[PDB]
Amino acid sequence: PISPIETVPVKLKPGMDGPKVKQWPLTEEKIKALVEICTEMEKEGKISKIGPENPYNTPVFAIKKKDSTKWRKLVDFRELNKRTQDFWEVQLGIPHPAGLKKKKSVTVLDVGDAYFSVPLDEDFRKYTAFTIPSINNETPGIRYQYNVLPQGWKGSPAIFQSSMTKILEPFKKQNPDIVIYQYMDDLYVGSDLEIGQHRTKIEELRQHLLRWGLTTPDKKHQKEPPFLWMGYELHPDKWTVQPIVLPEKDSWTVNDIQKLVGKLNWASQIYPGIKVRQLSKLLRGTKALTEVIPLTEEAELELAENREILKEPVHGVYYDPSKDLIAEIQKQGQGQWTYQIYQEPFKNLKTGKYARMRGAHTNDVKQLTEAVQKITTESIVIWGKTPKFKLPIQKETWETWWTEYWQATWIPEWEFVNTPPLVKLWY
Amino acid sequence: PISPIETVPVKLKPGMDGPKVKQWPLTEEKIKALVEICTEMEKEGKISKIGPENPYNTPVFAIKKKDSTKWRKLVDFRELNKRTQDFWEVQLGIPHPAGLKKKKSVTVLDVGDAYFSVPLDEDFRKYTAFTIPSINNETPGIRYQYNVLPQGWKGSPAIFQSSMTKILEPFKKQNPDIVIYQYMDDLYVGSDLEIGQHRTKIEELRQHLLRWGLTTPDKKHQKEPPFLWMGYELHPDKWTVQPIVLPEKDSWTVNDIQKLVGKLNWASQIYPGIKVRQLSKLLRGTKALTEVIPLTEEAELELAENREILKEPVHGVYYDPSKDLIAEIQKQGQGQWTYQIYQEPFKNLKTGKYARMRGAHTNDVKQLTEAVQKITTESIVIWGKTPKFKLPIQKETWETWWTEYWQATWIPEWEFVNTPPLVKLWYQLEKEPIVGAETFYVDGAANRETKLGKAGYVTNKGRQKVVPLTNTTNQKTELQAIYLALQDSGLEVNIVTDSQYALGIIQAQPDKSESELVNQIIEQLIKKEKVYLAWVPAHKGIGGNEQVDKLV
Numbered sequence: 001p002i003s004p005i006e007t008v009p010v011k012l013k014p015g016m017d018g019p020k021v022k023q024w025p026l027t028e029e030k031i032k033a034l035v036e037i038c039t040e041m042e043k044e045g046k047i048s049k050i051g052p053e054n055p056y057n058t059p060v061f062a063i064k065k066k067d068s069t070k071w072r073k074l075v076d077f078r079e080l081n082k083r084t085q086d087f088w089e090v091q092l093g094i095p096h097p098a099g100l101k102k103k104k105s106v107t108v109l110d111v112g113d114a115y116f117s118v119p120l121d122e123d124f125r126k127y128t129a130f131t132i133p134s135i136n137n138e139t140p141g142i143r144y145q146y147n148v149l150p151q152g153w154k155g156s157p158a159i160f161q162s163s164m165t166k167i168l169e170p171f172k173k174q175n176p177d178i179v180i181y182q183y184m185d186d187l188y189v190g191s192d193l194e195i196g197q198h199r200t201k202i203e204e205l206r207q208h209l210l211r212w213g214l215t216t217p218d219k220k221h222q223k224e225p226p227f228l229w230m231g232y233e234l235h236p237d238k239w240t241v242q243p244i245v246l247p248e249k250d251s252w253t254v255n256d257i258q259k260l261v262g263k264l265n266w267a268s269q270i271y272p273g274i275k276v277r278q279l280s281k282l283l284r285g286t287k288a289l290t291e292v293i294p295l296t297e298e299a300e301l302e303l304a305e306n307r308e309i310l311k312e313p314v315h316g317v318y319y320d321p322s323k324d325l326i327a328e329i330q331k332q333g334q335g336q337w338t339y340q341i342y343q344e345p346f347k348n349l350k351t352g353k354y355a356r357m358r359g360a361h362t363n364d365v366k367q368l369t370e371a372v373q374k375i376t377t378e379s380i381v382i383w384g385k386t387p388k389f390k391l392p393i394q395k396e397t398w399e400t401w402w403t404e405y406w407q408a409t410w411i412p413e414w415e416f417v418n419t420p421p422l423v424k425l426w427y
Numbered sequence: 428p429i430s431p432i433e434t435v436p437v438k439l440k441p442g443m444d445g446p447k448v449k450q451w452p453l454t455e456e457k458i459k460a461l462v463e464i465c466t467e468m469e470k471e472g473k474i475s476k477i478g479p480e481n482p483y484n485t486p487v488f489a490i491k492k493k494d495s496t497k498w499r500k501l502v503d504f505r506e507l508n509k510r511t512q513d514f515w516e517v518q519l520g521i522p523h524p525a526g527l528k529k530k531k532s533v534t535v536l537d538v539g540d541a542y543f544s545v546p547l548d549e550d551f552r553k554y555t556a557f558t559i560p561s562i563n564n565e566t567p568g569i570r571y572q573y574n575v576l577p578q579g580w581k582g583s584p585a586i587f588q589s590s591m592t593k594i595l596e597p598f599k600k601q602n603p604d605i606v607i608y609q610y611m612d613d614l615y616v617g618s619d620l621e622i623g624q625h626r627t628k629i630e631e632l633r634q635h636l637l638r639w640g641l642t643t644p645d646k647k648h649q650k651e652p653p654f655l656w657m658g659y660e661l662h663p664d665k666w667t668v669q670p671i672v673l674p675e676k677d678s679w680t681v682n683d684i685q686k687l688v689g690k691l692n693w694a695s696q697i698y699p700g701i702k703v704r705q706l707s708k709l710l711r712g713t714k715a716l717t718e719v720i721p722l723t724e725e726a727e728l729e730l731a732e733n734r735e736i737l738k739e740p741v742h743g744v745y746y747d748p749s750k751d752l753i754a755e756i757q758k759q760g761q762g763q764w765t766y767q768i769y770q771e772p773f774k775n776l777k778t779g780k781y782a783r784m785r786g787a788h789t790n791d792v793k794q795l796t797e798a799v800q801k802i803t804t805e806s807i808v809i810w811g812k813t814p815k816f817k818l819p820i821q822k823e824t825w826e827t828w829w830t831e832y833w834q835a836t837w838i839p840e841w842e843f844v845n846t847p848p849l850v851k852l853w854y855q856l857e858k859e860p861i862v863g864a865e866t867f868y869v870d871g872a873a874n875r876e877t878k879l880g881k882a883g884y885v886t887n888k889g890r891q892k893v894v895p896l897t898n899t900t901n902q903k904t905e906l907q908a909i910y911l912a913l914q915d916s917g918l919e920v921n922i923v924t925d926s927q928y929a930l931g932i933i934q935a936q937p938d939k940s941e942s943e944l945v946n947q948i949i950e951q952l953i954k955k956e957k958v959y960l961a962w963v964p965a966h967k968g969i970g971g972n973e974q975v976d977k978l979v
């Protein structure tokens with residue numbers, strides 16, 4: 001702002017060169033947006049213009065955080081990160097409270113705004129270079145380099161750490177039990193209070209950061225409810241299991257049994273303790289598909305005990321901070337999108353699901369984009385780190401739309417997969 | 428001469444120091460031929476002499492391949508460029524014309540030897556040191572250093588165009604109506620002010636430019652609509668491709684079939700319906716730069732139709748920012764889909780094709796999307812917005828597939844067009860088993876080595892069969908069976924396969940395939956009334972699948 005700070009030297013990994021990722025092409029809506037936002041930042045000295053000596057380059061999109069109040073810049077520093085924040089995952093690494101996932105409620109407010117004060121280490125700037133495209137490349141992109149810890153970049157936080165924990169102490173006093181996880185751009189306050197009270201703690205907190213320096217646009221509504229007044233409140237209590245619905249309707253046919261013998265014979269990897277031969281012996285004959293069959297010996301029992309190990313979660317499933325978190329989401333049916341967040345095939349960590357409205361924006365590429373931002377937060381909150389998604393979506397379709405319904409300040413990592421086969425009907 | 432211009436600071440790649448290559452004391456003829464050139468340079472300020480104390484050296488050459496007036500000195504910077512930091516590659520993005528906007532008066536100024544006036548970091552000049560020799564061990568050599576942008580250096584097309592852009596900025600803010608664009612050595616300036624009213628600004632442009640060392644001759648200059656750029660033909664309102672000639676022979680070799688196929692895509696930018704499947708299905712081989720590749724029957728027919736097309740020349744219209752873009756897809760049948768982008772019906776902005784180069788099985792609906800997609804992505808790049816589609820498909824055909832297709836897609840708004848072929852689900856499988864319909868417990872294993880198999884079935888109705896197969900894979904049989912069952916059964920049938928391959932295939936509902944059998948198992952689906960497929964894992968699932976797995 002107006003009171004210089006001793007910048008914090010920043011070293012890209014030895015042998016690692018700044019990023020040179022190419023700028024995704026934008027709508028002109030998105031440019032005009034960013035084009036304005038930037039000029040702004042530029043006046044504020046927030047960030048400046050560079051030259052051809054800087055060959056580095058990281059992506060920048062534009063989305064809407066509020067509703068449509070007005071656009072917001074979102075630099076996809078996913079790269080500069082791997083080439084930084086990974087080694088700046090320790091050097092100045094922010095810890096993760098493994099209890100936060102338990103508070104009665106977790107409100108989520110950002111602070112990305114704070115970073116915008118601490119000058120960035122002169123030598124490192126060049127790597128945060130980001131470039132506003134032009135429509136049809138009819139002009140040389142406008143080139144900007146940051147002069148303050150930009151936001152998306154996972155090291156603006158770590159540098160700002162010290163400063164936060166300092167602004168956030170005179171509140172940790174008052175309200176002990178409140179947990180505060182700052183992951184990148186946003187703070188995660190979590191408390192076991194009757195809503196209204198917690199909600200207060202938050203506003204009571206926000207008002208804190210606020211009378212100190214930070215500002216939190218967290219003004220969610222404004223004394224007015226017309227059936228849409230959302231302020232990020234999660235509830236890590238219901239983060240739970242088990243909806244693998246084995247049919248029940250007591251009238252099974254050769255066809256009904258058939259499918260069963262399969263889904264059961266499927267989970268033999270995620271569950272090696274399930275037999276089926278005895279129920280498959282029920283099929284042993286070449287009977288019609290719409291004929292009803294009868295419950296056999298161990299089979300009738302086998303449906304019980306094999307519907308029983310189907311209640312006791314797979315053991316051996318422990319988070320491995322070494323490995324990565326993968327999360328494959330799968331189109332289920334209208335509105336519902338089942339998912340899983342494993343680290344090593346068939347050892348699933350969480351297996352929720354999700355849904356959205358038909359009439360109102362009934363869309364896949366929207367649901368998914370939300371089922372991610374949601375699936376993601378389960379993570380940020382649970383294991384304090386965004387996953388990598390095996391997105392059942394055409395690389396280029398997603399490539400085009402996500403930015404839209406995308407609310408978040410972060411971009412996870414993702415990839416696109418050919419076809420889930422015998423998995424949409426199971427979990 | 429040189430400029431007052433601020434000099435972009437350059438640094439050589441980490442640690443690496445300056446080049447120290449030597450000149451092979453060449454034709455003492457050319458020698459004094461450089462000595463005169465160099466001297467006209469040091470005077471123009473372009474370079475300078477320096478005490479041999481700490482410099483390096485780059486090979487210095489003098490030449491004139493030519494059959495003209497003089498000699499040109501050419502410094503080989505290879506081993507310097509191998510030591511210079513990298514720069515911001517900006518020609519990396521090329522503006523596609525189909526998104527350019529009409530423009531009245533367009534001019535281009537020659538800047539080519541302008542970089543010679545743009546200073547060079549006064550601290551990266553030592554590395555441009557070169558040594559022009561003397562008669563023969565006559566002088567240590569006339570020794571100079573570059574003061575501006577060496578004509579070879581890596582960081583030159585960059586630093587120049589940087590510097591340039593900067594210089595023009597103000598002139599571009601006091602003429603916010605006109606527009607300037609550069610291209611290596613070509614600066615083009617296009618505007619609206621009548622060519623006359625245009626000339627002044629270009630002169631003012633020239634006067635602005637000269638106010639910064641950048642000079643600009645008008646003689647043997649350029650204005651030649653058509654403008655040959657990036658392999659285009661640019662007129663102040665229309666646009667098109669380089670003269671596209673399709674060589675003809677009776678003997679083809681990859682080296683030529685490629686230049687043929689590629690050149691055939693480039694034309695697709697504006698030439699309607701151009702195909703390329705059949706033609707490049709050939710170059711679909713091993714690295715033979717001269718393998719004698721004999722055009723097959725389709726290649727011919729296809730190359731033929733590309734002529735019928737390419738023959739008749741075509742034009743390209745521009746984009747009106749104030750008029751929604753439209754785009755239509757036509758299906759050519761062989762996974763070949765052609766499109767064209769319009770704002771106004773009897774002329775184009777740009778056209779295009781899309782073919783499912785992918786794996787082994789696809790779909791006209793699926794493809795229609797990929798195409799719908801391929802297009803969307805292009806618009807965003809060119810015009811900065813997505814187009815309003817008009818596609819050969821019905822809301823009912825679409826919505827069904829996406830609602831029953833495991834992958835998640837999203838097609839912007841789209842208006843239907845009865846223009847056949849009509850994209851439409853050629854069939855659907857039962858979600859539930861048909862009651863009363865004979866069940867075909869099917870299968871067909873094969874010997875991986877013996878390349879010999881069997882494929883038959885066994886019905887509840889007690890009806891069996893086992894046809895023999897020679898020259899077959901296993902998946903080939905797991906599909907023979909199916910086809911086989913479908914074959915001896917009523918307009919209603921329930922099929923049981925142990926083949927997830929066969930299933931994962933059928934379930935995708937391919938309307939066509941690269942297989943001789945999947946295209947047959949398809950036209951039997953097309954004919955049936957009620958078909959429901961079922962999956963029972965091979966071995967374990969030897970339930971009813973038992974009797975079926977034994978015979979074979």
Ligand SMILES: N#Cc1ccc(NC(=S)NC(=N)Cc2c(Cl)cccc2Cl)cc1
Nearest residue numbers: 527528530533606608615617661662663
């Ligand atoms: N001939 C020609 C010609 C055709 C179209 C346009 N229209 C536009 S919007 N382009 C420009 N602003 C500038 C421009 C480009 Cl992109 C490429 C070559 C030359 C020039 Cl001047 C400019 C020139």
Ligand SMILES: [Mg+2]
Nearest residue numbers: 870925965976
């Ligand atoms: Mg079998």
